[PDB]
């Protein structure tokens, strides 16, 4: 009966990989780069089994 | 010029040691002062007066 999509679970990812900045200096140089990530969504934890030992 | 009256002379001694090179070792710098020296003009003047009959 919901209006959602029914995901149980997901995996909500803002982006895998930025290339934030370069900065060049007189002997080195330096480059930064991020990323982004909620963590994993469940939405119906009811629809989960999990077994620990086998 | 000759409508001057000194003349300048600039002399710069420079200053600097150069050190073993290292990538992450802090850049040694260069620098110079400045001293002058200053002469006075002296200005000779000497004519001449003709005559027709001379």
């Known amino acids: 009966g919901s209006t959602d999509g029914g995901s149980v679970f997901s ?3 803002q982006s895998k990989f930025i290339t934030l900045g370069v900065e060049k ?3 080195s140089y330096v480059e930064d780069f991020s990323n982004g990530t909620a963590g994993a969504l469940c939405k119906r934890p009811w629809a989960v089994v ?3 030992g086998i | 010029s000759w409508e001057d ?3 300048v002379q600039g002399i ?8 073993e090179y290292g990538d992450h070792t802090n850049i040694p710098l260069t620098s110079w002062n400045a001293n002058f020296e200053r002469r006075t003009i002296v200005r000779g003047e000497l004519g ?3 005559g027709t009959l001379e």
């Open chain 1, 11 to 13: 995996q909500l990812v």
């Open chain 1, 25 to 27: 200096r007189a002997k």
């Open chain 1, 50 to 52: 999990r077994y620990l």
């Open chain 2, 5 to 7: 009256q000194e003349i």
């Open chain 2, 12 to 19: 710069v001694e420079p200053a600097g040691t150069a050190v």
């Open chain 2, 48 to 50: 001449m007066m003709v």
